Amino acid sequence: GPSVFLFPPKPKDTLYITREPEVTCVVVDVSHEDPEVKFNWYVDGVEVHNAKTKPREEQYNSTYRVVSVLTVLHQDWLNGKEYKCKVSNKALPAPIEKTISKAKGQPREPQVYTLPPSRDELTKNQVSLTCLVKGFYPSDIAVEWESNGQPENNYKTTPPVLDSDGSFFLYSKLTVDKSRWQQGNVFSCSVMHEALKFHYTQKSLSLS
Amino acid sequence: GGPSVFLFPPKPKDTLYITREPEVTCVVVDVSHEDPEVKFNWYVDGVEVHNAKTKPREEQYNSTYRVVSVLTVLHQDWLNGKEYKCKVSNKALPAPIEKTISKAKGQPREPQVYTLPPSRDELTKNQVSLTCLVKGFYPSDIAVEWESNGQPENNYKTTPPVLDSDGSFFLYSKLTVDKSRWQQGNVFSCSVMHEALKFHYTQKSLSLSP
Amino acid sequence: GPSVFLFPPKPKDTLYITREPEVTCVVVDVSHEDPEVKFNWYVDGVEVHNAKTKPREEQYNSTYRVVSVLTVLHQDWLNGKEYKCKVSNKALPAPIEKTISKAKGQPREPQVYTLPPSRDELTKNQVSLTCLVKGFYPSDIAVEWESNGQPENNYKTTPPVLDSDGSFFLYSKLTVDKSRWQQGNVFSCSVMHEALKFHYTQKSLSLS
Ligand SMILES: *[C@@H]1O[C@H](CO)[C@@H](O[C@@H]2O[C@H](CO)[C@@H](O[C@@H]3O[C@H](CO)[C@@H](O)[C@H](O[C@H]4O[C@H](CO)[C@@H](O)[C@H](O)[C@@H]4O[C@@H]4O[C@H](CO)[C@@H](O)[C@H](O)[C@H]4NC(C)=O)[C@@H]3O)[C@H](O)[C@H]2NC(C)=O)[C@H](O)[C@H]1NC(C)=O
Ligand SMILES: *[C@@H]1O[C@H](CO[C@@H]2O[C@@H](C)[C@@H](O)[C@@H](O)[C@@H]2O)[C@@H](O)[C@H](O)[C@H]1NC(C)=O
Ligand SMILES: *[C@@H]1O[C@H](CO[C@@H]2O[C@@H](C)[C@@H](O)[C@@H](O)[C@@H]2O)[C@@H](O)[C@H](O)[C@H]1NC(C)=O
């Protein structure tokens, strides 16, 4: 301390005109002895002044947390612009600098595959519906589930995992009551990624 | 300023296999060139032990040393929750640094293992994905491998454990095989080792269905 | 003078990770005049200090028995490490050293075969399920039975028998109610051995 963490936008914030992507600069372990924090922001090395800095917030471990948020243009993030947060504090020998950008490398479109429950799981009261998303680059991605136009919320999805060919994959597991699966209800896995056309794709799954 | 200590647990394949040696690893970084010697004292449930293995120091790029001591733990001791303490002494430290490590606490829960064949739409590709779903296990320490007709198979990747809504963990392991190997009827096996299994091992097989 | 006997661990203590294998150094004929006994222990020539010495026990013939117990690492015993107990006593002209190790020789993987009851045994209220385990080396092995994820405890296993080719074989007999066998219940013979892949294999048996 003080230490700085620079966070990227959320994957869905970059992909839809609907949402506002922005980069977040977090300073932790600010001592009560040195409460002042100054933020300077750079986009491709050019100083910018539109960042919104919040007032310091006291933490339970008797240190301050200070957050500055820079609202980022959609196309700028996807085109690989560089965002640098410069953090100044009197307890620092020199200011702390962090830089973030989207991963470089040619984007690769995710391949989406839905997998029904394993035969041995059909014995249980609730079954697992699986969505395999593989071969995508970069790793920023979002996955959701629906049934009959309505969102399904009983799902958990793994973080991206680096594959042997340089792309990423993950799995999403949706849990439903077995009865819903044998009624023949249709379930859909939704994937959001910059390499998809219109940044969206869908794959459905139902009893065969 | 000063050396820092990091204490690492044994790995789940070392702990669960009788022929391997599970080890607790005590790592000291930021060891200076002027005072490079590090003395390690090890304790199991507070009693000093003397079987630790000293590794050769390794010079780092920022002109400091990394110094490591490795304690082999009894298989049954680690699984019974004994506490392992590494005490690190160095002439640049005003007082020795102590770190303690133990196995994750909580009621153990047995993994459920399910194999999933490739998606119908993936069969058009030259390579297909065999999926192993491992769920409902606690703690998260687990090992997963793949075999083919009993033989080790290595083009697989396994996700990290993910916390489920009920407090247990799950993961997926993905094996990639040539379509022709799947279409020949070869049997593929997902093998998992976990402390909550009887015999600490279980396997589920998968092959082309008629 | 005193005599020393060095005993190996119990074979199943080495094959189960939750069990504790130990080598035991026993000294008998320790005199009343020279009661002091010192133990030094070595693993592959390296002295170790974790041995537990028991208190002297006076015997009926007016001599002492003194025992020291060394816990061996599972992998150390199985990898063929050599254990030396060195015993010093003032009545000995020179210390007595005893060495013990696992049987050497190429490990050979067990072949596991299940055998249903003989037709003539079906007249009885209880039947014998047989597990034949053959061709294994060394003779250290463990056999258990399960049904439907649960242990079956009504079994007995023969000791290993040396076969004509230098390997060992044994038989395990599980006794079950005939009705359980005729219901189609599946029974499994589980064996643990260092030469098996994953040190484990299982063979099932049910009404044909
Ligand atoms: C007082 O209480 C506050 C609570 O607010 C604490 O603040 C917390 O401080 C934590 C650090 O002490 C923060 O933890 C970080 O959280 C990030 C979570 O996203 C995470 O990304 C960070 O992980 C990186 O840095 C770690 C080192 O600190 C590494 O262990 C880790 O592997 C990560 O390292 C990066 O790795 C990638 C590749 O994988 C590299 O590309 C990066 O360059 C690496 N980063 C580098 C080298 O810097 C870390 O876990 C936590 O966010 C924060 N909480 C909040 C709400 O802000 C104070 O610590 C606490 N202080 C005391 C004294 O109690
Ligand atoms: C000094 O450098 C050590 C080396 O750590 C490794 O190498 C550097 C270059 C990075 O890649 C780092 O992420 C690696 O883990 C560090 O162990 C040590 O913390 C460093 N100490 C200081 C004070 O910088
Ligand atoms: C003295 O006796 C020691 C103990 O004898 C053994 O244990 C007792 C409990 C009896 O069961 C006895 O029959 C056993 O043989 C022996 O270890 C030792 O050899 C004996 N020595 C002499 C000289 O008699």
Numbering used by the authors:
A (entry chain B), C (entry chain C): 237 to 444
B (entry chain A): 236 to 445
Q: Would you copy out the relevant sentences from the publication that reported this structure?
A:
Binding to the neonatal Fc receptor (FcRn) extends serum half-life of IgG, and antagonizing this interaction is a promising therapeutic approach in IgG-mediated autoimmune diseases. One of them is an IgG1-Fc fragment bearing five amino acid (AA) substitutions (M252Y, S254T, T256E, H433K, N434F, or “MST-HN”). IgG1-MST-HN exhibits increased binding to FcRn relative to IgG1-WT at both physiological and acidic pH, but retains the natural pH-dependent binding profile. To gain insights into the binding mode of the Abdegs to FcRn, we determined the crystal structure of Fc-MST-HN, both alone and in complex with FcRn.
